Design a protein around this nucleic acid. Sequence first.
DNA 1: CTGAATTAGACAATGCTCTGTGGCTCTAG
RNA 2: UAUGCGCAUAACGCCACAGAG
Lengths: 122, 48, 79, 47, 57, 126, 234, 49, 96, 176
Amino acid sequence: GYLTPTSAREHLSALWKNEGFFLNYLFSGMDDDGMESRFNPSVFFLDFLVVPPSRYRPVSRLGDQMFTNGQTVNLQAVMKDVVLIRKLLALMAQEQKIDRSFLSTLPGQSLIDKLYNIWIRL
Amino acid sequence: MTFETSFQFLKQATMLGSHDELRSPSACLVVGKVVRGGTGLFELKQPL
Amino acid sequence: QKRITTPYMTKYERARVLGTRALQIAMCAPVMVELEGETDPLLIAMKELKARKIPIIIRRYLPDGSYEDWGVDELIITD
Amino acid sequence: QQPMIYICGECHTENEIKSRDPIRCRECGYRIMYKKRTKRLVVFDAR
Amino acid sequence: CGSLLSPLLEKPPRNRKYNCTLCSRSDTIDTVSVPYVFRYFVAELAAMNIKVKLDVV
Amino acid sequence: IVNKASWERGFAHGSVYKSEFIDLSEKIKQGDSSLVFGIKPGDPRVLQKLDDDGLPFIGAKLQYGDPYYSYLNLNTGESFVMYYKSKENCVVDNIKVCSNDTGSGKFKCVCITMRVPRNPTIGDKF
Amino acid sequence: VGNESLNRAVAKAAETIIDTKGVTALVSDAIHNDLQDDSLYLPPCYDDAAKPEDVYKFEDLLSPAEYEALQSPSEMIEENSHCTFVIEALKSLPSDVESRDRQARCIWFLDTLIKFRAHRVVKRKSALGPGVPHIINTKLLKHFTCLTYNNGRLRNLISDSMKAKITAYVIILALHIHDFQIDLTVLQRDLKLSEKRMMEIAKAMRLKISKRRVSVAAGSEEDHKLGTLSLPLP
Amino acid sequence: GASMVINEDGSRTALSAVDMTQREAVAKQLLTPATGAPKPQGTKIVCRH
Amino acid sequence: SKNMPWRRLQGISFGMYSAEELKKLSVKSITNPRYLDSLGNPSANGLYDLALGPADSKEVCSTCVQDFSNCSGHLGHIELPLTVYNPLLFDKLYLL
Amino acid sequence: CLELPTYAAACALVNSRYSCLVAGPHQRHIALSPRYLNRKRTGIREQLDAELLRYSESLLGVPIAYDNIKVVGELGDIYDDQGHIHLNIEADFVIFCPEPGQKLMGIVNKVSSSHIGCLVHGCFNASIPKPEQLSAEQWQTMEINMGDELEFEVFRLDSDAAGVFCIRGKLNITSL
DNA sequence: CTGAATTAGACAATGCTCTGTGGCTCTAG
RNA sequence: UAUGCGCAUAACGCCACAGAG
Ligand SMILES: [Zn+2]
Ligand SMILES: [Zn+2]
Ligand SMILES: [Zn+2]
């Protein structure tokens, strides 16, 4: 059985509810001075990436041709996939649960849930 | 980090919550501070 | 307490004493010695070191964090 | 006044070329044209 | 709170003061002298959700 | 050690011929595809320093900051001038003007070749 | 290996994320597919850029010698962007001098916009040129610049987005003024820009676009026209 | 010689290679006290060769 | 003019952030995958948005009002729809 | 007329019933120039005079006068590569900490259509907007204490562009 | 019915500084 | 940031070859 990140978060949260007194000493990063549940298992997971400032990601133009650097390209490859998942969760919305298109068929599937392949892609 | 495999030592320092006292010669030059050896073991004070 | 380090000024201390004092004479700090036509602040700082007329305190930090204070007047300078 | 003469690479005939006209030799149609050197003062040192 | 990422300038009404976005107090902000590549370093570590906490004393 | 008087006579004197191929389509991509070498007549940036085709004379010398070529936009009228950015004084050797493969190309590709003197100095390797 | 059991394990998180963010918030994923081309006016409601207060009643001149004075003659190279000396042919049909049209002779606002755009990012000028309409100067310093801290002082700057906003509003003015047939290459000649800019602004007016270089040999030695849009009336 | 003269407020007066009149005017204007700008903490810096 | 820094780093510590602390640090949720429009300017809600820093001297910021020479730079965030692992901690998450 | 007040035993006690000239000893930080190794008092007084009439969020107000200049410690902290010696001072200040909506008094410069600049304690050129949209007939027929001395309210405070803590407060007559 | 040593695979490192030119950076569907 | 006269123009990487000590 596949273990989704939303299920692994709940498994860490229950494991931390039990065994957190010990694992706060192996992971001392978050929340300085180390008393009353400082580290938390939510840093094992990402709800959002962080876009670094745009002055550290400059585009290198040379006579009417822009060239993006690699950092902005990897962030854009995350973001196009984010848009794709957001449209697909819109399609699972109002379906077995107006203004729909069903245009998204580019991922790999034989089912409705392309969420598996598009999760591993994200 | 400045020696080798900087990402693994960065990952260990982030997991363990490691503190750097900034007294190494590499750590003083990362943060732009005068290195402790040589003409940096001491400080000069102006009497008032 | 009794100061238990070297009575001699080390070679690293006279570099930073001459650097700090020449940076002071680079600003309009008053010169304690007679300028014999020098325009270089290093040469003026060397004349002030030779004449024992620099007032700066060297704070010699020991590796536990402790220190002890020495004026350049009470250090033995050599060539 | 003082036309811009260009010399064909093959037939070496002199070609006047304006801004808008296509460049090719008026006799043999060749594609490379060399600019003519005209009389004008340049000063060099004999050293 | 020891953070380069936290100070922020007020939108003008002048005054030109900074606010720590974390602790919401304008008193604790002062300048240090770092390399510019150290600022690039702490921004690229913030891109990986790594906190760099400075002891500024 | 080289004798000074042999060096002052012709011993091991040289040259280097730099050829710079200037294309107004490839580099100067602003739009409208109608750039041709030329000057706006009455331009004080090119007077007695470029020829009437916006292109230096063949005997000419080029110091730093001299006008190197001039090109004008035909659908607009505005003439631009480009300056010589190298730090070495050269003498223009020849200027060849190129068409496309058909003979239908317009006056926009050119290939200036310049001679830099390079006689033996202190620091040259024999 | 997986199974159809991975479909059930992923469908649990799907049915979870349908909760806590409702179906209206998920149908609102249709945002940011084509939100807005920014830093210019909206596609509807063509009454922009001239509010009915502070209309043109300010510093008006009238002569055919004033038409001749485009180059500012004497015995001072030129004082206009000369698009007004193109629109003067359409302006001369109600009246040759000081035409009281239903466009209210608002071409001087376009002139002040081009005089403001070419003037650079650094402005010591509290008043721009003569600077007689102060509410117009207020609208320019409110919408067509950006304030900036500098060493405890403040200075208005004209960013590239602002320079594109001014230019796009000049386009929107000159389209309805010159009855949807405009000569953009005159603006290229007089205002020192590139033709990639005007082609990309033509792309920015994507809705109902069909452009043709109509007038050939219109000048003394060159051809210049582009800017046919063929839009419904304002 | 000197490439430029840094003033007391951090403004860099670049010396001109063309005219000696500007450089004479700058050389007269050295050593003068704190000007109408309220920055009396420093003197000028001459970036000499 | 006056030396603006006289403070001094005594030490540096490495840790992780909570997501609340980044969401306080971030100034703009970044949504649009298209960087630049047809007219060349940076987009709204894109990776080069001006609520972050300007990337060159030709523009100013939106959060602060400074130019490129005085803007510190600002963080933005791509709000992911669903949860992904943290690749820094994926090995230790696998072991736990 | 921007005339420099002396300390004057706490500025002749201009902490009146209205104007808040609170006095309390404070410590400041001084980057002394190396030309003041001798005459340290002169350089400290000069940098404190540079600090005057400028709002300090650490002092929570605007200093108008200082006295009892005392030096904390006899050692001056020369940092690494810079020339300025950094000594920590202790002085007794008289500071001006205003608030929004509170009472002040002023000596006027002008009364135009919309600008009234009143000197608060002879230093602060505090401007007052004259109309408060109640009537335009209150511009003439004075009735707003149009004399040499005036008392007013403050709604916002924003510093001036060059070396002055400016005060922008409307007149706010108690009746009408 | 599970700790045991062992072995194959993965991976990380491999001198320093400097000067040029030339092609390509989104062509394929 | 550089050049030119506050103004105008130009604001780069990755491979692969070749070379210097
Ligand atoms: Zn021929
Ligand atoms: Zn804080
Ligand atoms: Zn900013």
